[PDB]
């Protein structure tokens, strides 16, 4: 809103021919929207997006707890756990699986048991670098090319 307001003002000026371009009105609402982003001190960006129906026992959470990847600024890899299928119509990650995969850079599928592994295979068919294993069927198959 604020920028298109600026556009109108720059254009109107120009077309008429013959320095704060943000009026006070616009500085207020900008300043409000910036402050609402403030987070409660020492709060870190969560490692999980959902309410876990068994927070304490969950294998994934507990493992990332055990390695203490807690998303603090010092940490150079961040951790996001999304315990639900992806759907384009979600408030959080508005992507279909196929969209989300394409937007990523590298898929990591360190499988121990996996007679084929359709997940890596279809990752690759959408043109995305991927790490599988040699106990994965798709891995084994790839290893012979």
Give the residues across from 107 on adjacent strands.
130
Stretch that binds other proteins, among 1-9, 59-67, 75-83, 103-111 (CB under 8 A): 1-9
Among 57, 66, 89, 134, binds other proteins (CB under 8 A): 89
Find out whether 116 is annotated in a ligand binding site.
Answer: yes
Q: What angle do CA 48, 77, 87 make, to 5 degrees?
A: 40
Q: Which of 23, 28, 49, 141 binds other proteins (CB under 8 A)?
A: 28
DSSP secondary structure letter of residue 98: H
Q: Where are the beta strands (DSSP E) in 9-138?
A: 107-108, 130-131
- Residue 134, interface with other proteins (CB under 8 A)? no
Picking from 71, 29, 26, the residue whose alpha carbon sits closest to that of residue 46 is 71
Residue with tokens 């995305």: 128
Kindly tell me which residue out of 61, 69, 90, 142 binds other proteins, with binding defined by CB under 8 A: 90
Site string for other proteins, 47-86 (x = CB under 8 A): ----------------------------------------
CB neighbours of residue 9 within 10 Å: 13
DSSP summary character for residue 89: T
User: Does the annotation list 13 as a binding residue?
Assistant: no
Is residue 85 within 8 A of residue 92, CB to CB? The reply is: no
Pick out the residues of the known binding site. Answer: 105, 114, 116-117, 119
Report the interface residues with other proteins, using CB under 8 A. Answer: 2-4, 6-7, 10-11, 14-17, 19, 21-22, 24-25, 28-38, 87, 89-91, 94
Binding positions for UDP are 119
């Amino acid at each position: 809103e604020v920028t298109t307001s600026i556009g109108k003002r720059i254009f109107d000026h120009a077309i008429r021919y013959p320095g704060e371009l943000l009026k006070s009105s616009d500085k207020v609402m900008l300043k409000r929207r910036i402050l609402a982003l403030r987070r409660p001190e020492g709060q870190l960006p969560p490692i999980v997006t959902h309410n876990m129906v068994d927070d304490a026992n969950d294998l994934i959470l507990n493992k990332i707890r055990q390695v203490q990847l807690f998303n603090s600024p010092s940490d150079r890899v961040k951790m996001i756990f999304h315990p639900e299928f992806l759907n384009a119509n979600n408030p959080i990650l508005g992507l279909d699986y196929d969209e989300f995969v394409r937007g990523c850079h590298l898929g990591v599928f360190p499988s121990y048991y996996e007679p084929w592994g359709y997940t890596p295979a279809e990752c690759t068919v959408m043109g995305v670098p991927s790490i599988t294993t040699n106990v994965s069927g798709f891995g084994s198959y790839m290893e012979d090319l």
